[PDB]
C-alpha cells in the first residue's frame, strides 16, 4: 500500500 | 514528480472493427458503471500531482481507468472483448494494490467490480 486517497463521503 | 502521460487511446496502426460484444461493452457495461454513484474515482487517470500522491506511479506501473477504457472503445482500440475486460481487471487490481483495506475507495471498487462481473455475464452472442 501507499499513502492512500482519504475519505470519499461514505463513512464512518 | 510529474504525472505520466495517460494511456494510449488511439492507434491507427492497429486494425479496427465493431462487434456486438464491443458495442455492448461501451453502451451497456461501461455506461452502467460510469453512471454509478461510486464511479467517479475511476473516471479518469489518477492525477498524482493534484492529489499529492508522490508514490502512486512508483507503485502502479500499469495504470488504467474507465475514462481511458471509454476512449479506447470509442476509437475501436480493442479488437477482442477480452482486451477491454482485461483493462477493467487491471483498474480494479491497481486500486487494491495502492489503497489500504478498509478505505472508502476499496469499498467503491468492490461494489463496481461486482456490478461489472454481473454485466459481463450478460454479453451478447459473438459473430
Author numbering:
A (entry chain B): 1 to 12
B (entry chain A): 42 to 168
Q: What do the authors of the reporting publication say about this deposited model?
A:
Bromodomains (BRDs) are protein interaction modules that specifically recognize ε-N-lysine acetylation motifs, a key event in the reading process of epigenetic marks. The 61 BRDs in the human genome cluster into eight families based on structure/sequence similarity. Despite large sequence variations, all BRD modules share a conserved fold that comprises a left-handed bundle of four α helices (αZ, αA, αB, αC), linked by loop regions of variable length (ZA and BC loops), which line the Kac binding site and determine binding specificity. The four helices form a deep cavity that is extended by the two loop regions (ZA and BC loops), creating a largely hydrophobic Kac binding pocket.
In order to determine whether the diverse sequence and spacing of histone Kac residues can be accommodated by a single BRD, we systematically determined cocrystal structures of BRD4(1) with the diacetylated peptides H4K5acK8ac, H4K12acK16ac, and H4K16acK20ac. In all cases the two acetylated lysines bound simultaneously and with identical conformations to the BRD4(1) Kac binding site. The N-terminal Kac always formed the anchoring hydrogen bond with the conserved asparagine (N140). In the N-terminal region of H4, flexible glycine residues allow variable peptide conformations with two (H41–11K5acK8ac) or three (H411–21K12acK16ac) linking residues, whereas the large side chains in H415–25K16acK20ac fit perfectly into surface grooves created by the ZA and BC loops. These structures explain the similar affinities observed for the various combinations of di- and triacetylated H4 peptides. ITC data collected on the first BRD of BRD4 showed a 30-fold increase in affinity between the singly acetylated peptide H4K5ac to the most optimal wild-type peptide H4K5acK8ac. Consistent with this notion, ITC experiments revealed a binding stoichiometry (N) of 0.5, indicating binding of two BRDs to the H4K8acK12ac peptide, whereas only a single binding event with significantly increased affinity was observed for the H4K5acK8ac peptide. Intriguingly, the wild-type sequence “GG” of the H4 K5/K8 linker region seems highly optimized for interaction of the first BRD of BET family members.
